[PDB]
Amino acid sequence: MRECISIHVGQAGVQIGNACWELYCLEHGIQPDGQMPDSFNTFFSETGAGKHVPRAVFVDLEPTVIDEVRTGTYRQLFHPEQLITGKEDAANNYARGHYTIGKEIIDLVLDRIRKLADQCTGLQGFLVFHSFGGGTGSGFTSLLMERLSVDYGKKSKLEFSIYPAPQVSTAVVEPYNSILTTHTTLEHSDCAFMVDNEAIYDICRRNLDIERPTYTNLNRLISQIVSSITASLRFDGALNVDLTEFQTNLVPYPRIHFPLATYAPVISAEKAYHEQLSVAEITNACFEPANQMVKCDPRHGKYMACCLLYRGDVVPKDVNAAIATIKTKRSIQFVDWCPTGFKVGINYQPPTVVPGGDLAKVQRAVCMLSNTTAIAEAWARLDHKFDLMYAKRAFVHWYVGEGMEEGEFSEAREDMAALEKDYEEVGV
Amino acid sequence: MREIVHIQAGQCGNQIGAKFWEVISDEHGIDPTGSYHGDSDLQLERINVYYNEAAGNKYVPRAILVDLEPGTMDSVRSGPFGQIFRPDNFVFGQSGAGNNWAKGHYTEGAELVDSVLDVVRKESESCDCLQGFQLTHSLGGGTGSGMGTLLISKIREEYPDRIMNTFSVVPSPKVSDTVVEPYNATLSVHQLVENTDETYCIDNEALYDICFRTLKLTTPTYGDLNHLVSATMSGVTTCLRFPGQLNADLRKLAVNMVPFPRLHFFMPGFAPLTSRGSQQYRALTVPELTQQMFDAKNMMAACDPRHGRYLTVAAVFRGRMSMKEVDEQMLNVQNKNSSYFVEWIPNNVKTAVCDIPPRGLKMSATFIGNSTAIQELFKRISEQFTAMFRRKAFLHWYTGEGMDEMEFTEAESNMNDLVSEYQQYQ
Amino acid sequence: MREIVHIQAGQCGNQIGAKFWEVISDEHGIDPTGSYHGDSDLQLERINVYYNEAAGNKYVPRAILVDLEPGTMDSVRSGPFGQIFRPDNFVFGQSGAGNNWAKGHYTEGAELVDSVLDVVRKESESCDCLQGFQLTHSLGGGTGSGMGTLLISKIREEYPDRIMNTFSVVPSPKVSDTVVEPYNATLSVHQLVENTDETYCIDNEALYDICFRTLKLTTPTYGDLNHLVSATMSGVTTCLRFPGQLNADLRKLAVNMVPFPRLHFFMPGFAPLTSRGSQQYRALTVPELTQQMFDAKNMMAACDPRHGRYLTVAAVFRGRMSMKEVDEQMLNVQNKNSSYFVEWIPNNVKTAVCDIPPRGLKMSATFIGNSTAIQELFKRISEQFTAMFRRKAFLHWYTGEGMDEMEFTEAESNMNDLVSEYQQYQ
Amino acid sequence: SSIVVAIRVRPFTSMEKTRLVIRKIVDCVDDRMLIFDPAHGGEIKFVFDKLFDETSSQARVYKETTSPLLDSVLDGFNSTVFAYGATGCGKTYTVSGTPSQPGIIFLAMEELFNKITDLKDEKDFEISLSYLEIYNERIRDLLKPETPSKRLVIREDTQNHIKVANLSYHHPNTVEDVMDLVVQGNINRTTSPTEANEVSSRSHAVLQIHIMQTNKLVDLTSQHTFATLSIIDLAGSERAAATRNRGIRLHEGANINRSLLALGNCINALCLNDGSRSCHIPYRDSKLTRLLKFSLGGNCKTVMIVCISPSSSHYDETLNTLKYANRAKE
Ligand SMILES: Nc1nc2c(ncn2[C@@H]2O[C@H](COP(=O)(O)CP(=O)(O)OP(=O)(O)O)[C@@H](O)[C@H]2O)c(=O)[nH]1
Ligand SMILES: Nc1nc2c(ncn2[C@@H]2O[C@H](COP(=O)(O)CP(=O)(O)OP(=O)(O)O)[C@@H](O)[C@H]2O)c(=O)[nH]1
Ligand SMILES: Nc1nc2c(ncn2[C@@H]2O[C@H](COP(=O)(O)OP(=O)(O)OP(=O)(O)O)[C@@H](O)[C@H]2O)c(=O)[nH]1
Ligand SMILES: Nc1ncnc2c1ncn2[C@@H]1O[C@H](COP(=O)(O)OP(=O)(O)NP(=O)(O)O)[C@@H](O)[C@H]1O
Ligand SMILES: [Mg+2]
Ligand SMILES: [Mg+2]
Ligand SMILES: [Mg+2]
Ligand SMILES: [Mg+2]
Predict the structure, then answer these.
(1) What is the CATH number of the domain that holds B181?
(2) Whether residue B140 sits in one domain with residue B27
(3) Contact B194, B152 (CB under 8 A)
(4) Residue whose CA is at the smallest distance from ligand 3 atom 12
(5) Nearest atom (ligand 1) to Cα of B72
(6) Which of B197, B264, B421 to mutate: most D Cβ within 10 Å?
(7) CA A228, CA A364: separation in Å to the nearest integer?
(8) Residues B56, B152: one domain?
(9) Whether A71 contacts A18, CB under 8 Å
(10) Measured distance CA(D23)–CA(D315) in Å, rounded
(11) What are the recorded Gene Ontology BP terms (chain A)?
(12) Which atom of ligand 2 is nearest to the CA of C204?
């Protein structure tokens, strides 16, 4: 039954994967060599007594990242036909990821995906991890998702993507890749997620009291988020929300692929002894911008949908009271056409935290999946940065030199405008 | 995979290259016999990029020495590199150009290049996945300029998809070594801008100021100039050789370095530049690194960035660092110095952080600035070129090689157009 | 079984042959007394092929020395071969041809050959299963050319089913030793092409370049020339003497060497050719062997393969090797250099791998190239022949032996036809 | 003065007729307006300077499009002909192609010769032809590629006179032989038989007519009339993969896309400059645009002739092709 296939396209996704599978190991009790001392079948498959290995495909054109895995803790976990390497880098270039180089690795990748699919009995869907900045993260993701649609049709495909920060950027042509990729996401993704490194960095600095934030602990937060999302299938609690069920509640109109995944409560392992983290208290926190994982301000938009995935020692009764409280908060504005836009999941499986980070282990947590129209603002910022460079065709020769057509940028940009317009319409 | 073929064109290129290969060998724990005596895995993880592991586990630099003056080979070979560099890599003629670009390009260099390319091809076949070429030389003339130019053109033709990366010593504005620097530089640069993908502007005069004033040294030698240059070269491909917390590597970097094919002449810098005494009053933090890294006084080219505009700055870090710490400094700098950056380029500074610091340092950072201020280099050289060319001074040294005033006129014209392009982007 | 009768015709043949027999004896652990002091089984497994085990377990080379100048015998016999070669194998007259093919063929050689063939027949009866004959000599004239030619014709007549394999020194294009090389070579070659099955073109000039430039030697001696030749000879019958992972041996090889009866003149080469110093920058892998093996500069004949087309290349390897490693290199080479191979011959390179490397080497490879570029040898010699013959220069030295201009004209004509055939197949 | 954008649609063939019952992606509604959509964003409207279609003869297209440019050549300044399309849309075809078809090259020469006969009493016509080929960022002699590609001084005089290397120049005396030189150039021109567009113009080409007229009358000035006419062919454009492009095949696609990128950038800059008070166009960015230093944006008039493929199989290609042409003007 219910099984997942994870695909780690970007190294962001790989490092997230490292955190995720590290977490999954702890949560299911599985060792780095696959040794166990059940529902783990959703993520791991037995390959002989006491040899449970992860149902995932890692795709890199740049073995360095894979080699980190092959020389890291879970080299004894992942096998050689999961850890797929290529030859030439995608040079942060959608054209190379989707075409020039990626076209020569996609065939291998798909064959390994098909293998895992053949090994599945109840494939729920695919968990794709990547960025909107990298070449493979962008272009290859685009290539792959197209191919996945061909192979698996309506089988659910999630895109857990790293969303370019409004200030904390790393590269210069991030807008180029982001715009081209998001077009494909809208075409092929069944539900897409966005993570802002900048937002989390401030969350770490403030809520976790972190003097020096980085990807290690940032990813651990992401793994808590994703674990909470998938907790409903891998663990049997009270209200187990399926991926189809997530779509049912989080999609009122086909194109709405935003749901911001807000994890609460981001408490440091110190103040936790003073934090009275009740169901209501945590809920109050999760509906604030204080814990939002994308830089924005939801109070200037409207909530189309809001799913709250509670986890651990959570009581429906207390949840209902907490929800009613939230419902009276005028700071939370739902769309007029969805008076019932609330979804509750409750999973009896205490939040699990992996040693090697802060994120105090708590008895209660909630992942809010928020479809708020304000996200169009973030999209506008991205589009603007794109326009600034695009107006001068800056760096365009790096894409055109890979055979990229100018219209690919123009058309993708137009689709991105339509995306915002869709968020404008549902706000009415 | 991702092997790099290094070429040392000319005595300058050979001396700098030797220092470079000293640095790399030191970083990777390789002694002068080729034997590896390190202690990590990462030292060998990408050793293939720069070395061929010969029988006996002897790591031989994938480097070719190109020259027209015998004894130049020995100026390297007589040192540790008598056991490091391969005899087949010492490829040279028996003439010399005498600081004459044409002699080292059209005639004497053209006689040599056949045997150089043969060795190049050997290494090309020896490589499992060639990432590109790396040439070190000078614009002073002769081999480095002429032969360097020739090799770039020939190799580019053979490998149009693997464009050569160039580290070249440019003409100083005050500290001149010869008279016809404007000729040799102008002729070479005319060709370089058409063939190279990225050129590092290395100015001895600026380096002299760094050594003397920033590093508080007495009498800056060539070895001290090369120390700074080789530090840069190591930084440029640190993320190639070693792992970090993210990673856009070499070509992935290149895509974000320039928004145009021609304006690919960068100024290099190195953050941690200080005297041993003054280190005791400094703190090991990225904020200190960035204050030094973005200091125009520590630029290795004699052009003041602030006179122009930044198309982009690459900031390549080495050592365990916080991404927040680094990126916040980046943001603070771009915001505070926003007046020096190009308005319509959202992000004007690129972040890359490798977790492996330089030997002897706890941390460092490499500055690669794409600023239009470099136009001053090209403008001044063109002016000096005009000063001589207008009188046909020394002209006969090149017309004897089959050159004509038209070629010179075109080379000058082209450099002027290059300056104009910088002014336009400024 | 599969015994080979070796003949050393002329001083060149005797000196090369001596070196050959030194090499073989060394490889098989046989000292100069004939005593075997090896350590394997394979050293004796096929020792019968080259040696007769005389009473006392003394292995005597199945080799016959043929000569017209006493003292030539002693130039070999006075060395280790005074205890190795049999006295009955030192078969010689007391005249000398004076670099005159006719004297060593029609007259003086014809007087000797009766007693040579008698010794040949003795060895023929001594053999249990004669595989064929092997002749070493030269095209310089006299014994090697004339007597060598005579022996080939006479022996071929006796053993039409056991055609003699020939290693012959050809005329150099610059490094000439005498004046009438065109006469003696032309006359001999005219006969050789009609009688021999496989001829190795050994050019001292090309070998001089190998010794001096490839091996980085000072003053290439005849012993160094013979080192290269004897290395080839050993390689040719390594798969005969020793086991491998497959095996097409000598005649099995021959079937795949030429697609025609006449065009059987091959260029020999040897992969592992390098100075002791430069070895330290080289790797022990077949990819290194093939890069050296397919290098036209390392050909032992003074003709550049690339000027013509390959009918086939035999690549005979020695030492423990991967069949995939070897064959992939073969495929890569034929594909990359496809422009130099004959279009309508599917496989233009033959693989043979014996598991027994040369003494002193971990691995090696022998190049035997069937290329039409060898036509340059024959063409140039014919031109030089014309230059002399057109004036009847030195003609009287042969008409005194009963020869006529018709014979000379025919010999020239035939060589020209041979060149044309190479041009046709090119 | 300003760049004229003219666009013509190639008719349907058996490659579409055997497909029929399929929809035309191009809806031309008048001489300037095109509509291009089946609904993805709704009807896409374009306005151009002059439109043609499958019902308008190429002979008349010439008469309205480049026949005035031939006149422009001799109005005290030179003039040239540009084009655009997505490999296989018509660029090469429209020069004439079929022997019974008059097109750009055929009629330019034919009309000129008629004018030469009439105007021979006013000025002499010393004319020479140059055949340039642009391939992998290399400029070769299209007619005779045997000439070392290094031999080309891509430079202009201070009078904007063409000052290049000793190319295989040829005088014209008829139309057929001149077109035969164009064809022989195309024979020696690099193509790729492996591509769908049988004999695609993989390398670009410049057919440069060097007109050196002299005054038949004697006067104080006694100055000659030099002017030129360039007919330019391109490799069109293809997708980044373009269906499993391999090695040099991909590299070629990149190079022609780079060439057209630089060309397009220079055109865009030029049209933006056509209104401003500067003209900083980096012609150096490509040997093609270096050759076109004055052809594009010097003292001349020109036209952008776009070839359109209405086939349903080339929707996105033509979509961008039309938007491209629009961008070229805007
Ligand atoms: N930054 C450095 N500059 C150097 C170094 N060695 C020389 N140079 C500079 O380069 C110029 C001298 O150049 P070269 O010896 O390389 C001339 P080359 O041998 O290439 O040709 P010839 O004319 O045949 O000697 C001059 O400006 C020197 O001051 C060095 O180690 N570092
Ligand atoms: N490659 C080698 N070439 C040799 C060697 N010895 C001689 N030669 C070459 O062969 C030619 C001399 O040949 P020979 O002494 O064999 C003539 P031969 O004794 O056969 O008849 P005569 O005229 O009666 O001396 C000449 O080109 C020498 O330079 C050798 O050991 N190796
Ligand atoms: N949140 C988070 N972001 C990351 C991490 N690693 C990289 N990133 C972000 O991902 C983007 C860079 O993309 P990568 O995933 O490194 O590139 P890639 O997918 O490997 O693509 P190529 O390397 O170009 O083939 C930047 O926006 C980085 O800030 C991580 O561990 N966590
Ligand atoms: N208007 C037309 N009528 C009939 N046939 C046409 C027409 N236009 C193009 N063709 C045909 O389509 C094939 C031509 O493609 P053309 O040669 O038109 O492609 P192209 O634009 O030069 N391709 P490319 O060189 O790659 O940019 C030719 O053989 C023409 O006959
Ligand atoms: Mg990556
Ligand atoms: Mg020198
Ligand atoms: Mg003799
Ligand atoms: Mg065409």
Answers:
(1) 3.40.50.1440
(2) yes
(3) no
(4) A134
(5) 19
(6) B421
(7) 11
(8) yes
(9) no
(10) 10
(11) microtubule cytoskeleton organization; mitotic cell cycle
(12) 1
